[PDB]
Amino acid sequence: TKIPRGNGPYSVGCTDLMFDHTNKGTFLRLYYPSQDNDRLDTLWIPNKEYFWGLSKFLGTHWLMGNILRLLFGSMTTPANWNSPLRPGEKYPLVVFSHGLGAFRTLYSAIGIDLASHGFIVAAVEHRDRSASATYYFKDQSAAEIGDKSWLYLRTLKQEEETHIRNEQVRQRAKECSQALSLILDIDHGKPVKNALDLKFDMEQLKDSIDREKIAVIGHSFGGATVIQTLSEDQRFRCGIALDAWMFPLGDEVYSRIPQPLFFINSEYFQYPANIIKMKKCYSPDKERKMITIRGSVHQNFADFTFATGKIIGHMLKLKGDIDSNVAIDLSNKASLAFLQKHLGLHKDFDQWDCLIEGDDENLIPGTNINTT
């Protein structure tokens, strides 16, 4: 695999958690500091139907689905599948929200890097029909047999976009808050039966969370989801929006976000109608920071930027002018510095405080889009 290993000192484990088993329950992929580092064997895209959904998302035919599966169906991401959680420390928690057409496993480069620095990361899978695909179970017996019900991305008419994208962002925010509540309840001993039968004992998570140190992060639609989530749920102490797509948000939200918020943008994705909405979040009584990564594209924040070579990836707009490892390192280091500042962590991530200010050859303070 060319998804980078995390740069921090902790070994990284990965598992999946679904509870309850229904379409209204929570589904997430967990990245976490692992006690041991025995093999990097997590499967990146774990089911054939995700490839089918990606093909529908792309507007391609039957054939693209099977082809993606042949190329990437056995690819790993560098985490220890179902490895025990590293004991004896409480970890800060990130809930992560994916973009339109994505699903929970496609931001492992970020999730694994955070976990390697001592975070637990809960990457939610949304059931708002913004994921290319997702699944749930119609009853407990279906969960026991592994009898999955698939839900695929909803395509919208233009007259639908304003109302449905706003309904979806509100559902997404609810799903982020629900995921946080599930993890906090497990932390304080709620018995949970994972609807997935996996060799990770969820009781390991009891007393494992630093409950004051919680953040929400997300890409694209997931960046709008950060803002909607912060507005509704003050258990989240700060947010980081990766190339936020601001269209889904209602006007009411802009004034209702007390928490610190960091915008990390790609150079080649942003446009004035979107940036003006980020600017609406600024106020002298609030902490808002923005940086833009030079030479990057929207896909630099997701794992398909690592899936292909330099030339095909550039042609497919999965890669920008900047090296993908260089770009994700800048985003991850700036994120860590921001998290340390606003969660009050006692780590050394303040070595990267300069990146929050845009002070790097590969960063722009603020944005290239000067509109206001």
mmCIF file of C-alpha atoms in Angstrom:
data_model
loop_
_atom_site.group_PDB
_atom_site.id
_atom_site.type_symbol
_atom_site.label_atom_id
_atom_site.label_comp_id
_atom_site.label_asym_id
_atom_site.label_seq_id
_atom_site.Cartn_x
_atom_site.Cartn_y
_atom_site.Cartn_z
ATOM 1 C CA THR A 1 0.000 0.000 0.000
ATOM 2 C CA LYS A 2 1.101 3.577 -0.540
ATOM 3 C CA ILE A 3 -1.152 5.037 2.181
ATOM 4 C CA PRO A 4 1.493 6.431 4.563
ATOM 5 C CA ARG A 5 2.128 4.993 7.979
ATOM 6 C CA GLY A 6 1.500 7.402 10.805
ATOM 7 C CA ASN A 7 4.401 9.631 11.832
ATOM 8 C CA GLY A 8 3.753 9.572 15.626
ATOM 9 C CA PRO A 9 5.301 7.251 18.188
ATOM 10 C CA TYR A 10 2.263 5.018 18.901
ATOM 11 C CA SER A 11 1.432 1.844 16.988
ATOM 12 C CA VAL A 12 -2.016 1.975 15.316
ATOM 13 C CA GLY A 13 -4.911 -0.455 15.488
ATOM 14 C CA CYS A 14 -8.164 -0.395 13.519
ATOM 15 C CA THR A 15 -11.591 -1.970 14.027
ATOM 16 C CA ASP A 16 -15.232 -1.362 13.100
ATOM 17 C CA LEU A 17 -18.182 -0.655 15.427
ATOM 18 C CA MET A 18 -21.875 -0.720 14.554
ATOM 19 C CA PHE A 19 -24.445 -0.060 17.300
ATOM 20 C CA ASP A 20 -27.327 -0.401 17.219
ATOM 21 C CA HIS A 21 -27.671 -2.647 14.148
ATOM 22 C CA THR A 22 -30.384 -0.536 12.492
ATOM 23 C CA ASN A 23 -30.309 2.180 9.780
ATOM 24 C CA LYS A 24 -30.657 4.687 12.657
ATOM 25 C CA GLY A 25 -27.737 3.284 14.659
ATOM 26 C CA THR A 26 -24.089 4.395 14.552
ATOM 27 C CA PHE A 27 -21.476 2.871 12.207
ATOM 28 C CA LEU A 28 -17.883 3.884 12.526
ATOM 29 C CA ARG A 29 -14.334 2.794 11.842
ATOM 30 C CA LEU A 30 -12.032 3.271 14.867
ATOM 31 C CA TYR A 31 -8.299 4.054 14.620
ATOM 32 C CA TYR A 32 -6.530 3.919 17.977
ATOM 33 C CA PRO A 33 -3.149 3.546 19.678
ATOM 34 C CA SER A 34 -2.433 -0.160 19.862
ATOM 35 C CA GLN A 35 -0.463 -1.957 22.504
ATOM 36 C CA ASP A 36 1.398 -4.018 19.933
ATOM 37 C CA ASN A 37 2.468 -3.641 16.260
ATOM 38 C CA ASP A 38 2.313 -7.129 14.783
ATOM 39 C CA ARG A 39 1.133 -6.614 11.177
ATOM 40 C CA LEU A 40 -0.330 -3.846 8.949
ATOM 41 C CA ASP A 41 -3.191 -5.893 7.587
ATOM 42 C CA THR A 42 -6.359 -3.736 7.657
ATOM 43 C CA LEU A 43 -8.269 -4.010 4.408
ATOM 44 C CA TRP A 44 -8.840 -0.542 2.897
ATOM 45 C CA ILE A 45 -12.193 -1.078 1.149
ATOM 46 C CA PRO A 46 -13.725 -4.086 2.806
ATOM 47 C CA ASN A 47 -16.742 -5.007 0.636
ATOM 48 C CA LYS A 48 -17.571 -5.368 -3.054
ATOM 49 C CA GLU A 49 -20.634 -3.147 -2.747
ATOM 50 C CA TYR A 50 -18.460 -0.099 -1.892
ATOM 51 C CA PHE A 51 -16.862 -0.462 -5.325
ATOM 52 C CA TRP A 52 -20.277 -0.738 -6.928
ATOM 53 C CA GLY A 53 -21.304 2.417 -5.137
ATOM 54 C CA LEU A 54 -18.173 4.309 -6.184
ATOM 55 C CA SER A 55 -18.963 3.378 -9.815
ATOM 56 C CA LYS A 56 -22.499 4.768 -9.471
ATOM 57 C CA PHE A 57 -21.158 7.921 -7.817
ATOM 58 C CA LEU A 58 -18.748 8.418 -10.743
ATOM 59 C CA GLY A 59 -21.544 7.966 -13.290
ATOM 60 C CA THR A 60 -19.699 4.974 -14.785
ATOM 61 C CA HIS A 61 -21.061 1.640 -15.855
ATOM 62 C CA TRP A 62 -21.120 -1.837 -14.303
ATOM 63 C CA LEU A 63 -17.628 -2.395 -15.588
ATOM 64 C CA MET A 64 -15.876 0.360 -13.630
ATOM 65 C CA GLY A 65 -17.121 -1.268 -10.379
ATOM 66 C CA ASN A 66 -15.529 -4.645 -11.089
ATOM 67 C CA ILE A 67 -12.392 -2.954 -12.397
ATOM 68 C CA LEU A 68 -11.912 -0.874 -9.218
ATOM 69 C CA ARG A 69 -12.385 -4.029 -7.273
ATOM 70 C CA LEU A 70 -9.720 -5.838 -9.239
ATOM 71 C CA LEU A 71 -7.281 -2.993 -8.723
ATOM 72 C CA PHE A 72 -7.917 -2.156 -5.104
ATOM 73 C CA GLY A 73 -9.950 -4.961 -3.518
ATOM 74 C CA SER A 74 -6.962 -6.395 -1.718
ATOM 75 C CA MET A 75 -5.220 -3.176 -0.852
ATOM 76 C CA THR A 76 -4.356 -2.606 2.811
ATOM 77 C CA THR A 77 -4.016 0.482 4.920
ATOM 78 C CA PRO A 78 -1.216 0.535 7.554
ATOM 79 C CA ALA A 79 -3.011 -0.338 10.772
ATOM 80 C CA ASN A 80 -3.149 -3.513 12.881
ATOM 81 C CA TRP A 81 -6.655 -4.983 12.382
ATOM 82 C CA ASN A 82 -8.378 -5.676 15.739
ATOM 83 C CA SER A 83 -5.128 -5.128 17.725
ATOM 84 C CA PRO A 84 -5.657 -4.504 21.481
ATOM 85 C CA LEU A 85 -5.947 -0.938 22.620
ATOM 86 C CA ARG A 86 -2.856 0.426 24.376
ATOM 87 C CA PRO A 87 -3.739 0.465 28.049
ATOM 88 C CA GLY A 88 -3.115 2.885 30.890
ATOM 89 C CA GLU A 89 -3.767 6.290 29.332
ATOM 90 C CA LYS A 90 -6.888 8.359 28.485
ATOM 91 C CA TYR A 91 -6.876 9.469 24.853
ATOM 92 C CA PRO A 92 -8.346 12.563 23.230
ATOM 93 C CA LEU A 93 -11.094 11.754 20.688
ATOM 94 C CA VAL A 94 -11.751 12.891 17.112
ATOM 95 C CA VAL A 95 -14.998 12.181 15.290
ATOM 96 C CA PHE A 96 -14.374 12.381 11.515
ATOM 97 C CA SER A 97 -16.972 13.045 8.786
ATOM 98 C CA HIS A 98 -16.445 11.906 5.163
ATOM 99 C CA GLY A 99 -17.258 13.788 1.941
ATOM 100 C CA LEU A 100 -19.978 13.171 -0.626
ATOM 101 C CA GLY A 101 -19.472 9.798 -2.391
ATOM 102 C CA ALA A 102 -17.059 8.591 0.283
ATOM 103 C CA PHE A 103 -17.581 6.242 3.256
ATOM 104 C CA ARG A 104 -15.797 5.557 6.524
ATOM 105 C CA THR A 105 -12.575 3.884 5.379
ATOM 106 C CA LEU A 106 -11.322 6.437 2.829
ATOM 107 C CA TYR A 107 -9.591 8.855 5.244
ATOM 108 C CA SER A 108 -7.195 6.349 6.845
ATOM 109 C CA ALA A 109 -4.132 8.463 6.030
ATOM 110 C CA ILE A 110 -5.532 11.098 8.406
ATOM 111 C CA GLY A 111 -7.067 8.683 10.897
ATOM 112 C CA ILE A 112 -3.892 6.599 11.207
ATOM 113 C CA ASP A 113 -1.649 9.657 11.546
ATOM 114 C CA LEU A 114 -3.816 11.022 14.378
ATOM 115 C CA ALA A 115 -3.943 7.675 16.161
ATOM 116 C CA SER A 116 -0.138 7.338 15.912
ATOM 117 C CA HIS A 117 0.052 10.625 17.849
ATOM 118 C CA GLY A 118 -2.183 9.320 20.671
ATOM 119 C CA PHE A 119 -5.767 10.019 19.502
ATOM 120 C CA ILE A 120 -8.711 7.702 19.175
ATOM 121 C CA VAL A 121 -10.411 8.501 15.856
ATOM 122 C CA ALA A 122 -14.010 7.562 15.066
ATOM 123 C CA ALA A 123 -14.633 7.829 11.343
ATOM 124 C CA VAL A 124 -18.425 7.766 10.972
ATOM 125 C CA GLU A 125 -20.249 6.241 8.037
ATOM 126 C CA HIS A 126 -23.219 8.417 7.232
ATOM 127 C CA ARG A 127 -26.680 6.954 6.461
ATOM 128 C CA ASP A 128 -27.970 10.154 4.818
ATOM 129 C CA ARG A 129 -27.400 8.667 1.314
ATOM 130 C CA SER A 130 -24.338 10.869 0.860
ATOM 131 C CA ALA A 131 -22.025 7.831 1.158
ATOM 132 C CA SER A 132 -21.346 6.007 -2.081
ATOM 133 C CA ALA A 133 -22.578 2.962 -0.165
ATOM 134 C CA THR A 134 -23.275 1.907 3.409
ATOM 135 C CA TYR A 135 -25.082 -0.958 5.115
ATOM 136 C CA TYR A 136 -27.118 -1.835 8.156
ATOM 137 C CA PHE A 137 -29.201 -4.796 9.386
ATOM 138 C CA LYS A 138 -33.010 -5.094 9.345
ATOM 139 C CA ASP A 139 -33.052 -7.030 12.638
ATOM 140 C CA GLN A 140 -30.669 -8.699 15.138
ATOM 141 C CA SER A 141 -30.917 -12.099 13.412
ATOM 142 C CA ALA A 142 -29.734 -10.491 10.131
ATOM 143 C CA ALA A 143 -26.787 -8.949 12.047
ATOM 144 C CA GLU A 144 -25.879 -12.374 13.451
ATOM 145 C CA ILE A 145 -25.824 -13.989 9.992
ATOM 146 C CA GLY A 146 -24.055 -11.030 8.339
ATOM 147 C CA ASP A 147 -27.147 -10.467 6.133
ATOM 148 C CA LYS A 148 -26.503 -6.829 5.101
ATOM 149 C CA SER A 149 -28.932 -4.294 3.689
ATOM 150 C CA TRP A 150 -27.140 -1.824 1.372
ATOM 151 C CA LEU A 151 -27.980 1.861 0.943
ATOM 152 C CA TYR A 152 -26.498 3.693 -2.022
ATOM 153 C CA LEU A 153 -25.869 7.334 -2.806
ATOM 154 C CA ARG A 154 -28.917 9.427 -3.692
ATOM 155 C CA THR A 155 -28.502 11.557 -6.849
ATOM 156 C CA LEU A 156 -30.439 14.863 -6.717
ATOM 157 C CA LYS A 157 -32.392 17.017 -9.134
ATOM 158 C CA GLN A 158 -31.225 20.660 -9.100
ATOM 159 C CA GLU A 159 -34.510 21.777 -7.590
ATOM 160 C CA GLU A 160 -33.754 19.290 -4.783
ATOM 161 C CA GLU A 161 -30.252 20.415 -3.897
ATOM 162 C CA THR A 162 -30.895 23.254 -1.465
ATOM 163 C CA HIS A 163 -33.455 21.487 0.766
ATOM 164 C CA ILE A 164 -31.995 17.975 0.613
ATOM 165 C CA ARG A 165 -28.353 18.981 1.177
ATOM 166 C CA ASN A 166 -29.448 20.941 4.267
ATOM 167 C CA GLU A 167 -31.478 17.960 5.546
ATOM 168 C CA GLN A 168 -28.447 15.775 4.963
ATOM 169 C CA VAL A 169 -26.042 18.080 6.840
ATOM 170 C CA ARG A 170 -28.441 18.122 9.803
ATOM 171 C CA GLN A 171 -28.598 14.310 9.741
ATOM 172 C CA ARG A 172 -24.825 14.181 9.513
ATOM 173 C CA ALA A 173 -24.446 16.397 12.544
ATOM 174 C CA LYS A 174 -26.858 14.155 14.426
ATOM 175 C CA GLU A 175 -24.793 11.110 13.398
ATOM 176 C CA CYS A 176 -21.580 12.767 14.648
ATOM 177 C CA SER A 177 -23.215 13.569 18.012
ATOM 178 C CA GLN A 178 -24.678 10.062 18.207
ATOM 179 C CA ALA A 179 -21.270 8.487 17.509
ATOM 180 C CA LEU A 180 -19.720 10.660 20.209
ATOM 181 C CA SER A 181 -22.462 9.608 22.666
ATOM 182 C CA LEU A 182 -21.885 5.924 21.855
ATOM 183 C CA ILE A 183 -18.146 6.183 22.520
ATOM 184 C CA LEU A 184 -18.674 8.219 25.714
ATOM 185 C CA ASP A 185 -21.262 5.713 26.949
ATOM 186 C CA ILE A 186 -18.902 2.790 26.252
ATOM 187 C CA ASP A 187 -16.154 4.728 28.026
ATOM 188 C CA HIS A 188 -18.342 4.814 31.110
ATOM 189 C CA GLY A 189 -19.256 1.158 30.926
ATOM 190 C CA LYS A 190 -22.409 0.852 28.850
ATOM 191 C CA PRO A 191 -22.630 -2.751 27.655
ATOM 192 C CA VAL A 192 -22.629 -2.682 23.883
ATOM 193 C CA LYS A 193 -23.017 -5.678 21.610
ATOM 194 C CA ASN A 194 -21.215 -4.766 18.367
ATOM 195 C CA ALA A 195 -23.510 -5.700 15.457
ATOM 196 C CA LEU A 196 -20.316 -6.801 13.657
ATOM 197 C CA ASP A 197 -18.627 -9.963 14.940
ATOM 198 C CA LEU A 198 -15.013 -8.963 15.309
ATOM 199 C CA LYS A 199 -12.145 -10.014 17.568
ATOM 200 C CA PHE A 200 -11.886 -6.572 19.231
ATOM 201 C CA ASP A 201 -13.480 -6.553 22.718
ATOM 202 C CA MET A 202 -15.258 -3.211 23.057
ATOM 203 C CA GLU A 203 -14.873 -3.411 26.836
ATOM 204 C CA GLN A 204 -11.287 -2.278 26.255
ATOM 205 C CA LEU A 205 -12.687 1.176 25.587
ATOM 206 C CA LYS A 206 -13.988 1.533 29.155
ATOM 207 C CA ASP A 207 -12.162 4.427 30.875
ATOM 208 C CA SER A 208 -10.101 5.083 27.728
ATOM 209 C CA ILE A 209 -11.313 8.517 26.692
ATOM 210 C CA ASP A 210 -10.212 11.952 27.844
ATOM 211 C CA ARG A 211 -13.761 13.303 27.855
ATOM 212 C CA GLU A 212 -12.810 17.001 27.884
ATOM 213 C CA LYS A 213 -10.619 16.618 24.798
ATOM 214 C CA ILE A 214 -12.971 15.989 21.877
ATOM 215 C CA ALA A 215 -12.858 17.445 18.347
ATOM 216 C CA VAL A 216 -14.753 17.040 15.064
ATOM 217 C CA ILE A 217 -12.912 16.918 11.742
ATOM 218 C CA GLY A 218 -14.246 16.370 8.241
ATOM 219 C CA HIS A 219 -13.631 16.796 4.515
ATOM 220 C CA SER A 220 -15.800 18.541 1.915
ATOM 221 C CA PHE A 221 -19.444 17.737 2.875
ATOM 222 C CA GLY A 222 -17.765 16.538 6.082
ATOM 223 C CA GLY A 223 -16.294 20.067 6.517
ATOM 224 C CA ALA A 224 -19.857 21.522 6.447
ATOM 225 C CA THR A 225 -20.727 18.727 8.898
ATOM 226 C CA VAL A 226 -18.003 19.984 11.327
ATOM 227 C CA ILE A 227 -19.680 23.423 11.396
ATOM 228 C CA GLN A 228 -23.220 22.079 11.794
ATOM 229 C CA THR A 229 -22.029 19.686 14.545
ATOM 230 C CA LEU A 230 -20.181 22.382 16.513
ATOM 231 C CA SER A 231 -23.282 24.576 16.357
ATOM 232 C CA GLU A 232 -25.424 21.864 17.944
ATOM 233 C CA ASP A 233 -23.084 20.061 20.351
ATOM 234 C CA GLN A 234 -20.741 21.848 22.741
ATOM 235 C CA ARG A 235 -19.134 18.518 23.848
ATOM 236 C CA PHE A 236 -17.018 19.097 20.729
ATOM 237 C CA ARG A 237 -14.407 21.627 21.790
ATOM 238 C CA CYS A 238 -13.030 22.562 18.374
ATOM 239 C CA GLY A 239 -13.350 21.677 14.718
ATOM 240 C CA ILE A 240 -11.160 21.310 11.692
ATOM 241 C CA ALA A 241 -12.827 21.632 8.289
ATOM 242 C CA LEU A 242 -10.729 20.147 5.432
ATOM 243 C CA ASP A 243 -11.758 21.900 2.181
ATOM 244 C CA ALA A 244 -15.260 22.504 3.449
ATOM 245 C CA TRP A 245 -18.124 22.566 0.963
ATOM 246 C CA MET A 246 -20.302 25.240 2.581
ATOM 247 C CA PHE A 247 -23.422 25.044 0.373
ATOM 248 C CA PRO A 248 -25.436 22.685 2.655
ATOM 249 C CA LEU A 249 -25.352 25.065 5.652
ATOM 250 C CA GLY A 250 -28.264 27.260 6.673
ATOM 251 C CA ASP A 251 -27.673 30.944 7.432
ATOM 252 C CA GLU A 252 -28.502 30.438 11.092
ATOM 253 C CA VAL A 253 -25.418 28.437 11.806
ATOM 254 C CA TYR A 254 -22.842 31.155 11.239
ATOM 255 C CA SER A 255 -23.559 32.977 14.517
ATOM 256 C CA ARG A 256 -23.997 29.872 16.685
ATOM 257 C CA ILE A 257 -20.495 28.382 16.707
ATOM 258 C CA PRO A 258 -18.670 29.341 19.895
ATOM 259 C CA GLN A 259 -15.790 26.867 19.467
ATOM 260 C CA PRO A 260 -12.488 27.393 17.690
ATOM 261 C CA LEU A 261 -12.513 26.420 14.028
ATOM 262 C CA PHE A 262 -9.688 25.786 11.541
ATOM 263 C CA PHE A 263 -10.175 25.782 7.782
ATOM 264 C CA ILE A 264 -7.469 23.831 5.821
ATOM 265 C CA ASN A 265 -8.118 24.349 2.139
ATOM 266 C CA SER A 266 -6.728 23.002 -1.131
ATOM 267 C CA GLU A 267 -5.398 25.594 -3.582
ATOM 268 C CA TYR A 268 -7.239 24.310 -6.622
ATOM 269 C CA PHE A 269 -10.709 23.520 -5.176
ATOM 270 C CA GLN A 270 -11.881 26.790 -3.644
ATOM 271 C CA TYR A 271 -14.023 29.504 -5.203
ATOM 272 C CA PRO A 272 -15.471 32.801 -4.042
ATOM 273 C CA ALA A 273 -19.055 31.680 -3.378
ATOM 274 C CA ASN A 274 -17.672 29.049 -0.980
ATOM 275 C CA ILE A 275 -14.960 31.154 0.683
ATOM 276 C CA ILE A 276 -17.368 33.979 1.482
ATOM 277 C CA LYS A 277 -19.293 31.555 3.688
ATOM 278 C CA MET A 278 -16.119 30.606 5.582
ATOM 279 C CA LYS A 279 -15.504 34.310 6.071
ATOM 280 C CA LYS A 280 -18.977 34.660 7.572
ATOM 281 C CA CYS A 281 -17.694 32.509 10.467
ATOM 282 C CA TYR A 282 -15.110 35.106 11.509
ATOM 283 C CA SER A 283 -15.635 37.413 14.472
ATOM 284 C CA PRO A 284 -13.184 39.117 16.855
ATOM 285 C CA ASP A 285 -14.680 37.146 19.781
ATOM 286 C CA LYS A 286 -13.923 33.807 18.124
ATOM 287 C CA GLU A 287 -10.856 31.853 17.023
ATOM 288 C CA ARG A 288 -10.912 31.131 13.288
ATOM 289 C CA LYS A 289 -7.800 30.222 11.280
ATOM 290 C CA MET A 290 -7.380 29.406 7.621
ATOM 291 C CA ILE A 291 -4.536 28.055 5.535
ATOM 292 C CA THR A 292 -4.343 26.849 1.953
ATOM 293 C CA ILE A 293 -1.949 24.066 0.840
ATOM 294 C CA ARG A 294 -0.142 25.169 -2.321
ATOM 295 C CA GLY A 295 -0.502 22.998 -5.373
ATOM 296 C CA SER A 296 -3.115 20.703 -3.851
ATOM 297 C CA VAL A 297 -6.449 19.466 -5.139
ATOM 298 C CA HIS A 298 -9.624 18.493 -3.281
ATOM 299 C CA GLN A 299 -8.673 14.809 -3.293
ATOM 300 C CA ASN A 300 -5.355 15.407 -1.498
ATOM 301 C CA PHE A 301 -7.250 14.978 1.821
ATOM 302 C CA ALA A 302 -8.640 11.514 0.926
ATOM 303 C CA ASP A 303 -6.910 8.178 0.437
ATOM 304 C CA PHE A 304 -7.342 7.876 -3.323
ATOM 305 C CA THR A 305 -4.552 10.426 -3.658
ATOM 306 C CA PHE A 306 -2.262 7.486 -2.696
ATOM 307 C CA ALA A 307 -3.918 4.884 -4.871
ATOM 308 C CA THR A 308 -2.248 5.502 -8.222
ATOM 309 C CA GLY A 309 0.982 6.769 -9.682
ATOM 310 C CA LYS A 310 2.031 10.344 -10.147
ATOM 311 C CA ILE A 311 1.001 10.767 -13.772
ATOM 312 C CA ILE A 312 -2.372 8.944 -13.854
ATOM 313 C CA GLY A 313 -3.296 10.445 -10.471
ATOM 314 C CA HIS A 314 -2.608 13.972 -11.775
ATOM 315 C CA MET A 315 -4.685 13.243 -14.876
ATOM 316 C CA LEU A 316 -7.517 11.887 -12.693
ATOM 317 C CA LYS A 317 -7.304 14.887 -10.345
ATOM 318 C CA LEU A 318 -6.481 12.608 -7.457
ATOM 319 C CA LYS A 319 -3.115 14.302 -7.103
ATOM 320 C CA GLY A 320 -2.051 17.935 -7.382
ATOM 321 C CA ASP A 321 1.253 19.589 -8.216
ATOM 322 C CA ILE A 322 2.429 18.959 -4.636
ATOM 323 C CA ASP A 323 3.564 15.504 -3.506
ATOM 324 C CA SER A 324 0.620 13.721 -1.763
ATOM 325 C CA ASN A 325 2.724 12.740 1.233
ATOM 326 C CA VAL A 326 3.994 16.299 1.601
ATOM 327 C CA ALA A 327 0.444 17.707 1.496
ATOM 328 C CA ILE A 328 -1.063 15.226 3.987
ATOM 329 C CA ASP A 329 1.879 15.791 6.363
ATOM 330 C CA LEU A 330 1.221 19.543 6.327
ATOM 331 C CA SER A 331 -2.509 19.084 6.956
ATOM 332 C CA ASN A 332 -1.868 16.534 9.705
ATOM 333 C CA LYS A 333 0.844 18.561 11.469
ATOM 334 C CA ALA A 334 -1.150 21.782 11.374
ATOM 335 C CA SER A 335 -4.155 19.841 12.675
ATOM 336 C CA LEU A 336 -2.144 18.395 15.555
ATOM 337 C CA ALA A 337 -0.838 21.865 16.502
ATOM 338 C CA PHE A 338 -4.396 23.268 16.424
ATOM 339 C CA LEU A 339 -5.767 20.340 18.483
ATOM 340 C CA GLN A 340 -3.017 20.751 21.095
ATOM 341 C CA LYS A 341 -3.793 24.443 21.439
ATOM 342 C CA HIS A 342 -7.574 24.189 21.705
ATOM 343 C CA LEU A 343 -7.864 20.825 23.530
ATOM 344 C CA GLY A 344 -5.066 21.684 25.976
ATOM 345 C CA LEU A 345 -2.897 18.679 25.191
ATOM 346 C CA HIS A 346 0.461 18.133 26.889
ATOM 347 C CA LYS A 347 2.345 16.974 23.822
ATOM 348 C CA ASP A 348 4.948 18.521 21.511
ATOM 349 C CA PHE A 349 2.610 19.370 18.667
ATOM 350 C CA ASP A 350 3.219 23.067 19.286
ATOM 351 C CA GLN A 351 6.410 22.588 17.268
ATOM 352 C CA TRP A 352 4.066 22.993 14.298
ATOM 353 C CA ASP A 353 2.292 26.140 15.499
ATOM 354 C CA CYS A 354 3.935 28.024 12.574
ATOM 355 C CA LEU A 355 1.849 25.970 10.156
ATOM 356 C CA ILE A 356 -1.448 27.261 11.658
ATOM 357 C CA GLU A 357 -0.185 30.678 10.510
ATOM 358 C CA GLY A 358 0.577 29.455 7.015
ATOM 359 C CA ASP A 359 4.311 29.872 7.488
ATOM 360 C CA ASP A 360 5.757 27.182 5.133
ATOM 361 C CA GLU A 361 6.903 27.238 1.488
ATOM 362 C CA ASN A 362 3.967 24.972 0.652
ATOM 363 C CA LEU A 363 1.288 26.975 2.534
ATOM 364 C CA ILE A 364 -0.647 30.214 1.968
ATOM 365 C CA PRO A 365 -1.920 32.022 5.042
ATOM 366 C CA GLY A 366 -5.642 32.505 4.521
ATOM 367 C CA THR A 367 -6.700 31.927 0.954
ATOM 368 C CA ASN A 368 -5.853 32.895 -2.651
ATOM 369 C CA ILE A 369 -9.526 33.856 -2.956
ATOM 370 C CA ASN A 370 -9.526 37.485 -1.714
ATOM 371 C CA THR A 371 -13.319 38.027 -1.857
ATOM 372 C CA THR A 372 -15.210 39.610 1.054
#
